[PDB]
Structures are given as structure tokens and as C-alpha cells.
């Protein structure tokens, strides 16, 4: 019987590699632009440490495609199933918690001073962003212990002559637990951002959060449905594609629009401008 896995001989595989290259180089452009604008008003609103780390995690994540392609080994199953999902969840949680932070902010001080008086100082929403993160770990790492690590194989029935090699035992059940919290976060951020799509806050970042979260939600729902309908060879390529596109959505859809103001509206770069967005 014949082994099957992604290889560069395949037009869509190299196409995903090229798309990931475009994404990584564009995100590198984003970061090197931010690198000489550390304390500008728009970068200052970005979140400070949060934006640098998020960008950095994403810059790493794009390497998945070269590591995902080719004859599998456990060395690749380690990252594609646990590490890169961690890199992605850190970013999704950051976006969603920022969306919550922006909206409903007015009610925090006046109605809940008992909370806000301490929640404002020194960490605030960071704490929740941390806890969600470890919660995902409880899903991920222990889950990998349950399935164990292996580049397993399965058969495609249209002709059982050929066999898929993949780092994902029980793919649908494996992905269900992973995607439950992804859907929860995506829908929560989508709701908060859409309700707040009018707000000018932080150079009107709610609209871009809305765009990115909508893309993530639609793509996740689509892939879960498609996997519930299909189990053949193509699952791995599409799954990779959906991943890379999602990365693009996070990079170009959220930081891209801010960078689109950085260099092109030096008027809005002015420090005195910011008070008009209160």
C-alpha cells in the first residue's frame, strides 16, 4: 500500500507555502514598522507589551507550514498539535479580552467600583488572558497525553490501496475539544466588537476586531462542518490552508489597518489627536 502526505510536488501545497511566506514577510514589515514607532499614540494604544508579544508569536507561527509538510515524524506532531495551537490561542484571547475591555468600560467604574478600583491597577484584564491561556493548556497538553503522540495512519475507502499519514488521531473528536473554546472566544469577541462597532476607541479598533473575528468564526464553522461531512485525503491540506488564512486574518485584519494609519496619516499620529477619541 502507498503512503500519502503533503509534498512540494503538489501545486496547492507550494501555494500554501507561498501564501505563508507572504504572510510572514508582511508581518515582519508590520513589526519593523512598529520597531521605530514604539511610543507613538497608535502604538501606545496597541497595548504595549501585549502587541509586541502577539506579533512575535505570530511571526513564529508562520513556520508551521514547512514543519507541517513532508513525511511526518513525532517531531512535527508535537508542534502542529500542541505548540502552534498555543501560539494561536494566546493571540485570540488577547483580541477577545481587548474587545471586552473596550466595550462596557463605562459601566465598570460607576456601577462596579468595588471591582474596578483594583482591576484597573497593575494587571487588570491580563489576569483573565492568562487564565484562559492555561485553560486551553488543560485542553491541549493533557489531551495529547490521552491520545498519545504518534504520526498515525488511516485508509481512504474510494480505493484502500492508498493510506493517509497524519498527526491527528481521531481527528473529529480530537478537534472538537480544541475548537469548543475557540468558538466560545470567537463568538464572545464577535458579539462585543459588533455591539461596539460605533466606538472610536483606540483609533476605532473595534471595527477591525469585528472583521478579524468574523473571518475566524466563519472559517472555523466551515471547517468543522466540512470535516463532519468528509474524511478523505484532502482534509490535511484544507486544514492547513484554513490555518494559514486564519493567521492572515489575525495579522492583516487587525494590525494591518492600524499600520495603514501609521505611515499614511501623520496628522493622526499627532499626540494631541488622541484626546479627540475619548
Amino acid at each position: 500500500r502507498q503512503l500519502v502526505f503533503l509534498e512540494w510536488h503538489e501545486a496547492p501545497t507550494i501555494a500554501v507555502a507561498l501564501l505563508a511566506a507572504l504572510g510572514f514577510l508582511s508581518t515582519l514589515a508590520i513589526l519593523v514598522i512598529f520597531w521605530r514607532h514604539f511610543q507613538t499614540p497608535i502604538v501606545r494604544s496597541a497595548g504595549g507589551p501585549m502587541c509586541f508579544l502577539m506579533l512575535t508569536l505570530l511571526l513564529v507561527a508562520y513556520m508551521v507550514v514547512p514543519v507541517y509538510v513532508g513525511p511526518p515524524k513525532v517531531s512535527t506532531c508535537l508542534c502542529r498539535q500542541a505548540l502552534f495551537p498555543l501560539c494561536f490561542t494566546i493571540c485570540i484571547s488577547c483580541i477577545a479580552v481587548r474587545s471586552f475591555q473596550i466595550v462596557c468600560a463605562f459601566k465598570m467604574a460607576s456601577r462596579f467600583p468595588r471591582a474596578y478600583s483594583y482591576w484597573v491597577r497593575y494587571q487588570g484584564p491580563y489576569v483573565s488572558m492568562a487564565f484562559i491561556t492555561v485553560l486551553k493548556m488543560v485542553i491541549v497538553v493533557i489531551g495529547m497525553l490521552a491520545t498519545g503522540l504518534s504520526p498515525t495512519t488511516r485508509t481512504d475507502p474510494d480505493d484502500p490501496k492508498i493510506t493517509i499519514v497524519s498527526c491527528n488521531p481521531n481527528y473529529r473528536n480530537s478537534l472538537l475539544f480544541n475548537t469548543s473554546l475557540d468558538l466560545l472566544l470567537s463568538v464572545v469577541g464577535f458579539s462585543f466588537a459588533y455591539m461596539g462597532k460605533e466606538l472610536p476607541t483606540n483609533y476605532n479598533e473595534a471595527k477591525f476586531i469585528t472583521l478579524s473575528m468574523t473571518f475566524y468564526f466563519t472559517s472555523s464553522v466551515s471547517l468543522c462542518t466540512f470535516m463532519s461531512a468528509y474524511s478523505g485525503v484532502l482534509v490535511t491540506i484544507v486544514d492547513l490552508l484554513v490555518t494559514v488564512l486564519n493567521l492572515l486574518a489575525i495579522s492583516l485584519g487587525y494590525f494591518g489597518p492600524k499600520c495603514y494609519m501609521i505611515l499614511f496619516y501623520p496628522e493622526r499620529n499627532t499626540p494631541a489627536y488622541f484626546n479627540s477619541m475619548i
Binding site: 471595527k207 463532519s228 461531512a229
Partner: protein, 275 residues
């Protein structure tokens, strides 16, 4: 002697589906009646005038396809099922897209373009654009009927003591051919209405269209895993249900909330609240 098997009209699932047809089609007829009641009212005019009534009419002809699915199969019935469902559906959804287009021209497009383009969309051109969308759908339906028709299957051993009769679709592609036009209209409508925001003191049009598109997508997406899981004999029931629920999703988010204002809050039916 094996019994032939197909959905009997009296089965409780078919009874429930034809019951739901009562709610869907009766509400469609009631909304059309209310539109006839306040036909000249600016509200119907702001809602595109007669294109609104035509749309409702088309929606009924969409629900009218539900009757083709159950009962003793035939090749003609299998051929007719999909196109006679989705063609009326296109005749309806093109108008939702048109109103979404109107909201985009109003509240994101600069005035210099918008003042002309808003007048250019409306008039005879709106009717002819609906006709053009129906023409696209009809071309795709002709390609489907000739090159990728479904086949009547009588299967002799898939069951212990019965022979299973039903239409079977050649490839998911052949059905995708019929779902492309409506899917495309929905994508355009959502992208047109999603990001726009209105001033206060004016009618909130984009919200209803957004909810309509989301209901459409969610219905036809949930329809996939269920159709994959359901027994072979009962595939039609989830098709019919989708057609019903999909129609309901369009009704309850766009038309019915307008009839709600028409009947229970008529003070809003005033010129500058819409214009």
C-alpha cells in the same frame, strides 16, 4: 417479497414538515397582505416598493417546492426538486441584496457617487437586475438538469426486508451548482450590510439584513452534518426542513419585523424617518 420504502405523506415527520409549512406560508401570505394594506406607504416604498411584494411572492414559490420531495419517487420529480426550489429562492434573495446595496450606497459611498447611483439602481433597472439574477440561476439550473441530473435509485439489499427508493444526487458538486447563486447573493448582502452604521432617528435597515444572512448561513451549514448523519431513507426530510427553516429565517428577520412596525408602531411610517 420485499416492501418498497419511501416517505409516506402520513408519517409524523412529514406531518410535522407540512405543519411547519403552514406557519411559513401563512406568515408569508400575511406579510404580503399587510404590504397590500399599506402599499403606497413610504415604508413599503423605502423597502423598494413593489420589488418587496414580488419578493414575498417568490418566497412562497420557494416553499411550494417542499411538496416535491416526499412520496413515490419519479425521475421527473427528482429532476424538478432542486431547481424548482432554488430558482424562486433566487427570485426572492436578489431583492434583499438590492436593499443591502442601497444601504451601502447611502452610508459608506461618497455623496457625489451616491446621489446618482441610488437613483440609477431604482426604477426599471431594479426589476431588470432581478431578472438578470434569475437568468443566471436558470443557466446554472439548465447545466445541472442536462449534465448532472439525479438518478432514481431502487436498492434491493440495503435493508433487511425492504427495497429502498429515493433520488440520489450524482456529486456534491451537482448540488453545489444549484446552491451557488443563492450563496453568492448572501455573501454580497452580508459584506454590504455588515460594517455600515446608521445615524439616530432614522430606520435601522442593515441590522435586519445582517440577521437574515446569518440565519441563512447557519441553517444551510447545520443542514450538512444532519444530512450526513440521517438515515438514507430520511434524507428528503432534512432537505424539506432546511427549505422551510431557511425561509423562516428570512421571514422573521427582515419582513416580519417591518410588518411589526406597520401594525404596532405606525408613527414611524413617516417620510423623513426613512428618507
Amino acid at each position: 417479497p420485499r416492501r418498497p420504502k419511501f416517505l409516506a405523506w402520513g408519517e409524523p415527520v412529514v406531518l410535522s414538515l407540512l405543519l411547519l409549512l403552514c406557519l411559513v406560508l401563512g406568515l408569508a401570505l400575511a406579510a404580503l397582505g399587510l404590504s397590500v394594506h399599506h402599499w403606497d406607504s413610504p415604508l413599503v416604498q423605502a423597502s423598494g416598493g413593489s420589488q418587496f411584494c414580488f419578493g414575498l411572492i417568490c418566497l412562497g414559490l420557494f416553499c411550494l417546492s417542499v411538496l416535491l420531495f416526499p412520496g413515490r419517487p419519479s425521475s421527473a420529480s427528482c429532476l424538478a426538486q432542486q431547481p424548482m426550489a432554488h430558482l424562486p429562492l433566487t427570485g426572492c434573495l436578489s431583492t434583499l441584496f438590492l436593499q443591502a446595496a442601497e444601504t451601502f450606497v447611502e452610508s459608506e459611498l461618497p455623496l457625489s457617487w451616491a446621489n446618482w447611483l441610488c437613483s440609477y439602481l431604482r426604477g426599471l433597472w431594479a426589476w431588470l437586475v432581478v431578472l438578470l439574477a434569475t437568468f443566471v440561476e436558470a443557466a446554472l439550473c439548465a447545466w445541472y438538469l442536462i449534465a448532472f441530473p439525479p438518478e432514481v435509485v431502487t436498492d434491493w439489499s440495503v435493508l433487511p426486508t425492504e427495497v429502498l427508493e429515493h433520488c440520489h444526487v450524482r456529486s456534491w458538486v451537482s448540488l453545489g451548482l444549484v446552491h451557488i447563486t443563492n450563496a453568492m447573493l448572501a455573501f454580497l448582502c452580508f459584506l454590504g450590510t455588515f460594517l455600515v452604521q446608521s445615524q439616530p432617528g432614522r430606520y435601522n435597515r442593515a441590522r435586519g439584513l445582517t440577521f437574515a444572512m446569518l440565519a441563512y448561513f447557519i441553517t444551510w451549514v447545520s443542514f450538512v452534518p444532519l444530512l450526513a448523519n440521517v438515515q438514507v431513507a430520511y434524507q428528503p426530510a432534512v432537505q424539506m426542513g432546511a427549505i422551510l427553516v431557511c425561509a423562516l429565517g428570512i421571514l422573521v428577520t427582515f419582513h416580519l419585523p417591518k410588518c411589526y412596525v406597520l401594525l404596532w408602531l405606525p408613527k414611524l411610517n413617516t417620510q423623513e424617518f426613512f428618507l
